[PDB]
Every structure is written in C-alpha cells, then in structure tokens.
Ligand binder design. Structure first.
Ligand SMILES: COc1ccc(-c2ocnc2C(=O)NCCCn2cncn2)cc1Cl
Length: 332
C-alpha cells in the first residue's frame, strides 16, 4: 500500500511517495497523520488543513527548535493543504500527563531543558515579528532520548504589525494572556511569554496553574494567584477597558515546598499583568533557573550529552546583542 502525490519541498514540484499512513491527531483545522517516506524510510507527520498564513510562516522558518517543514501539497469536493513535517515521537503534554497520573513531578532538569528550548524558539520567531498565539504543552514536540524540543502548530500564528488590529479571542484558554481576556486588539508577541510562563508553572505544579471554566472565568483564575490587576495594569493591558478585589497569593505557597526558588522567581517574571514588564524570550534564556544547562559537566539523566543549546545566530540575539556573553558559557 503506497500513496503518491505531487509535492513541493518546504520551488520545483516532485512525486512524493509514502506508506503506513495512520491518524495520530484531530482538530478544527482537520487531521494529523503519521506516515513513512519511501526513499529514506523516514517518518513524517502530515497536517491536513481544509482550504492562509500558516504555509507562508512555515516556509520562512529554519531553526533547531521549530518543527521542520519537509514538503507541502494540496489534495482531495473540498481542497486541503497538507504540511509534511519531520516526525517527532512525543509532546511535553503527554510526558507531563504520565508524571501527573503517576502522582510524580517531572525532574527539574527536563523542565529547564524544555523551557529553555521553547524560549529560544520564541526569540527566533519574535525576531521576524511572528507571534505564535497558541503556546501550550501539546504544541511542544519532544524526542525523549535526546531531549530536543520542537515548536509546532503555526495555525494561529500571525506576523504582528503595529497599528493593525488582531483578534482578542485567541490562544488556548488556560494559556491566554490577561490582556486578551480584557479584549485587547493591540497586543504584542509578549502574549507568547505569558503562555510560556503558564507552561512552566504547569510543569512545576503537575496541573494547569489557571484552569478557567470559560474565557471570562479564566481572568478569575489568574486573580486567585496574581491578585486583582491595578487600574494602571488594566490600562497597559487594554486602555479602552473602563474582577474580585483581593490581594496576590505568595508565589512560594503556590508550588510544592521543595520547588527550586529560581523556578518560582522565573515564573513571577513571566506571569506579569503589565505586558511590557514580562521578560523577553532571550532574557528568559539568561535567567539563573537555566544555570545547570550552562554547566560544562551537565548531562541528560540517561547519561547522554544535552542538545546544542548555545549555537545562537545573530538573528536570535538581535533583540539584545550584549546578552551573548551571558548566554554563551566560556566552554562553548
Ligand atoms: C497540530 O499541528 C501539528 C501536530 C503534530 C505535528 C507533528 O509534527 C511532527 N511530529 C508531530 C506529531 O504529532 N508527532 C507525534 C507526537 C506525539 N503523539 C501525539 N499523538 C500521538 N503521538 C505537527 C503539527 Cl504542525
């Protein structure tokens, strides 16, 4: 059993053949398949989307921490866009769920590795003005043996342009920045930093930090930890907006007693009401929570070497070039 399609590399079209196709995922966009290519025997993921920005964004990206677009083709009385991506066996969500179900917390070495690679992938997309707008554990692909993380699902991604409005009802509820809940249309790529902060907090906690039962109750869940946002914080989130009045809960008492203090400190700097107050992805990479990753003697728990973490390009460093000396340890 073989499927042959006319596909373009992720230019000149060509006959692409694959076998062992099976459904692995399902969403509003359509289906996600796992298949094996004929020429190399390599496994691929095929994202089939019924019927704009995704393909254009996916074709521009070339980073170690972003899912690689191998080929693309249109198929099947309704037309679908099929994105052929290099297959990655796991997700942060599935790994975190296994630990959660077994009443265990993910070792902080993995939390450091996954969060650092997510921030690096964010520093790269934000350098082109591209905001992902769907940062959640499910969109963080993992190779369990090498601990290499790949950001995926650019279906909500948009190149943000100052002055031009954007939809407020975006991102998965639990990872939705408070300005979006307040109905902001002039938000920045800092919405992804809030989502990344929600992912970190979830990896430390064993469950989502803000589990809202609606897009409105989502703000109430944030208030239960961060306290009520001040009038100034509300103005910085959405100036057009003219909420229970309670104080912030201590950050240390949010997480289990033995949670590393640097993890707690990083959380507080990402989960800020004021969007501008939140760390940029590059500053997050530089945080003391990622110190272990800069140690020359650092290894993965299986004894293997950690992935290449400090091979930064001029593009990733463009937001703050003098950060390079702090980010790149002397051994690298
Ligand atoms: C919604 O968008 C996507 C969804 C997936 C990918 C993808 O890309 C490379 N690998 C995958 C992938 O799904 N791997 C399997 C991960 C674990 N798993 C889940 N169910 C069974 N196993 C890409 C895009 Cl863009």
């Amino acid at each position: 059993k073989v499927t042959t399609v006319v596909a373009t590399p992720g230019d000149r079209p060509q006959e692409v053949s694959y076998t062992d196709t099976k459904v692995i995922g399902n969403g509003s966009f359509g289906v996600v398949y796992q298949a094996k290519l004929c020429d190399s025997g390599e496994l691929v993921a095929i994202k089939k989307v019924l019927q704009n920005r995704e393909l254009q964004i996916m074709r521009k990206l070339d980073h170690c921490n972003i899912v690689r677009l191998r080929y693309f083709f249109y198929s099947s009385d309704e037309v679908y866009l099929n994105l052929v991506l290099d297959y990655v066996p796991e997700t942060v969500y599935r790994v975190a769920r296994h630990y959660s179900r077994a009443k265990q917390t993910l070792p902080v070495i993995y939390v450091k590795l996954y969060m650092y690679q997510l921030f690096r992938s964010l520093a790269y997309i934000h350098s082109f003005g591209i905001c992902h707008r769907d940062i959640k554990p499910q969109n963080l692909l993992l190779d369990p043996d090498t601990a290499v993380l790949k950001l995926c699902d650019f279906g909500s991604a948009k190149q943000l342009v100052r002055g031009e409005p954007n939809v407020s009802y975006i991102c998965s509820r639990y990872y939705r920045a408070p300005e979006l809940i307040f109905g902001a249309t002039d938000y920045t790529s800092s919405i992804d930093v809030w989502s990344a902060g929600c992912v970190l907090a979830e990896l430390l906690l064993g469950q989502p930090i803000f589990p809202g039962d609606s897009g409105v109750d989502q703000l109430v869940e944030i208030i239960k930890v961060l306290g009520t946002p001040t009038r100034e914080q509300i103005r910085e989130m959405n100036p057009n907006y003219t909420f229970p009045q309670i104080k912030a809960h201590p950050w240390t008492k949010v997480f289990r007693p033995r949670t590393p203090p640097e993890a707690i400190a990083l959380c507080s700097r990402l989960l800020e009401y004021t969007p501008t107050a939140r760390l940029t992805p590059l500053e997050a990479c530089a945080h003391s929570f990622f110190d272990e990753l800069r140690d020359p003697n650092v290894k993965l728990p299986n004894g293997r070497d950690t992935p290449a973490l400090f091979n930064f390009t001029t593009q990733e460093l463009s937001s703050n070039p003098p950060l390079a000396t702090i980010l790149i340890p002397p051994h690298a």
